Amino acid sequence: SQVFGVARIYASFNDTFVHVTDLSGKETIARVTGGMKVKADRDESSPYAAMLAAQDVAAKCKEVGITAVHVKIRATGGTRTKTPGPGGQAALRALARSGLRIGRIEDVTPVPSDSTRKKGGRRGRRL
Template structure:
């Protein structure tokens, strides 16, 4: 996904995740041209001190890959999880306890 969102779609789409589907179909077409018919997928959320759950576009992106005829091998979650005491950002109002 080396292109910007504006190069693929208009700004007047009803859903903000529609451009992800367009990217997925584009990736599937490129893979078919090269000769790849199967993919291993790595999904990543923000991680760290932010949310560790995947966003709403992840499931629809996988569906788009499957619908376009690609075989999906492994689905791996590669979200970074801190192993130390990294603190969240705190505002002034609720940060003092």
């Protein structure tokens, strides 16, 4: 006896997203970016913005009757890092703190099979 919205988190760097949808996700619901819960504008990726941010995800999920939740983590990804930033950790523990249930966890970080030539230039990024 429960329903399941899908998470749809992500934290590079300098920002992070708690972003609920349906389990299909052609529709969406309460999306929360970092800067939003911090106007320093400095630390937009903070172990905290995420923290008070996730709690928006169970305010506007424990609003439109999302009991419970399955949960996705994405890096940048791409070319980039594939080393999850702060975010995703603090979220993954604040989301458990907000009554929410949890189910099926897994990365999605977009991996390439090579090719797109990475930025910087040969001799590199450098201070």
